[PDB]
Amino acid sequence: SMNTLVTPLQRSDAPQLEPVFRGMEQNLGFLPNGILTMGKNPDLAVAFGGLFKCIDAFKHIPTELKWAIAMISSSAAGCMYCKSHFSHIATRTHVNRNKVMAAFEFQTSDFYNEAERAALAFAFANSTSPAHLDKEHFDELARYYSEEAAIEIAAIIAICGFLNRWNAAMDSQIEAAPRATLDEIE
Amino acid sequence: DSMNTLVTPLQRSDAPQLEPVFRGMEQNLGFLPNGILTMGKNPDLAVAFGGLFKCIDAFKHIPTELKWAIAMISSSAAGCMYCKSHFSHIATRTHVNRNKVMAAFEFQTSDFYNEAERAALAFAFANSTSPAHLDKEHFDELARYYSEEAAIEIAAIIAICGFLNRWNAAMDSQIEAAPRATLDEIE
Numbered sequence: 001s002m003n004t005l006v007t008p009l010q011r012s013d014a015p016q017l018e019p020v021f022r023g024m025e026q027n028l029g030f031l032p033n034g035i036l037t038m039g040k041n042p043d044l045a046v047a048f049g050g051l052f053k054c055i056d057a058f059k060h061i062p063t064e065l066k067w068a069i070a071m072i073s074s075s076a077a078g079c080m081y082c083k084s085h086f087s088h089i090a091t092r093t094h095v096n097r098n099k100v101m102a103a104f105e106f107q108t109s110d111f112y113n114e115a116e117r118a119a120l121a122f123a124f125a126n127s128t129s130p131a132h133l134d135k136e137h138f139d140e141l142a143r144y145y146s147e148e149a150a151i152e153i154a155a156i157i158a159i160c161g162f163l164n165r166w167n168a169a170m171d172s173q174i175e176a177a178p179r180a181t182l183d184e185i186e
Numbered sequence: 187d188s189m190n191t192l193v194t195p196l197q198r199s200d201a202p203q204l205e206p207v208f209r210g211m212e213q214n215l216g217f218l219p220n221g222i223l224t225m226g227k228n229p230d231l232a233v234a235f236g237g238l239f240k241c242i243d244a245f246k247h248i249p250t251e252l253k254w255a256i257a258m259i260s261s262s263a264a265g266c267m268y269c270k271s272h273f274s275h276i277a278t279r280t281h282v283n284r285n286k287v288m289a290a291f292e293f294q295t296s297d298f299y300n301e302a303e304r305a306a307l308a309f310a311f312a313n314s315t316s317p318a319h320l321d322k323e324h325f326d327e328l329a330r331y332y333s334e335e336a337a338i339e340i341a342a343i344i345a346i347c348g349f350l351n352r353w354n355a356a357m358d359s360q361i362e363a364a365p366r367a368t369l370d371e372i373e
Contacts, residue, residue, distance in 0.1 A: 002320070161345075168317075
């Protein structure tokens with residue numbers, strides 16, 4: 001890591017944050033060092049933890065699409081760390097391995113329908129610097145999703161906004177397990 | 187107007203439970219952005235994000251002027267003109283020295299900014315592009331001028347801008363007249 005200034009605490013040092021830690025590792029299998037670093041500001045960790053748990057609680061889009069959005073957003077933003085993690089989450093939860101592995105080709109892969117493509121294209125366009133969302137992105141989203149659903153899609157992308165920048169700021173190094181998933185999907 | 191016609195704001199009066207969240211935002215800004223009123227339609231999201239955003243004012247290890255300068259630079263790096271206008275507007279509402287705020291985007295050469303500020307703002311810029319272009323020097327320079335505690339708060343503000351830059355792009359939030367004025371001046 002390029003970052004030696006801000007180091008993780010030991011998990012046992014902050015029991016109050018166990019709700020936050022569990023939230024993340026439940027999907028992923030392990031606790032990322034980036035959240036242990038976040039722990040050194042307990043107010044921040046608890047508030048971010050609260051935001052992140054909103055993903056699992058969302059009701060208007062399927063679970064498989066939730067993690068696909070996070071995968072594509074993270075990739076568009078060029079955060080390979082977050083791309084590996086969300087990919088790993090997607091493969092841990094998904095019944096259809098092939099569909100997950102084709103996610104980054106969603107626009108031409110026949111594992112994805114037009115509704116999924118509308119959401120994932122929006123996620124891509126939303127996540128670059130600058131955003132390159134055009135009227136078509138919005139027209140297509142309106143064609144296939146309710147206001148409720150659109151909000152949850154935007155919300156996942158925005159939460160990736162947080163995590164993409166956070167993990168870049170910590171220079172989080174991709175763990176062996178996510179790395180395996182990432183090599184396979186690439 | 188906006189490219190987004192699907193997801194519209196509720197009226198402020200419709201969601202009084204969110205007033206704590208709204209106050210956090212508008213206290214600095216002078217008004218409640220439509221983007222937060224749209225966020226209101228998902229109470230879990232609004233409360234959680236509101237909680238996260240209030241962390242900025244509560245941060246203790248960096249000055250207030252630097253907090254909003256970071257958010258300005260991050261938002262600009264990310265090419266979100268909406269968030270750039272807002273944080274600029276916040277910075278002019280809270281800053282005693284209007285000229286220092288107006289020179290923020292030239293922080294690397296403006297005399298209003300010291301090396302500590304430049305280290306933080308350069309980190310904020312590099313952190314906020316797609317992809318991030320943080321290099322070892324960004325980290326070395328941050329370590330030179332900031333504690334671990336401070337670095338976390340800097341990263342946190344940038345990351346929160348991550349959320350807001352993308353959120354306001356997803357709503358295609360249109361820049362309000364007052365922020366617009368601030369933005370025209372600062373360019």
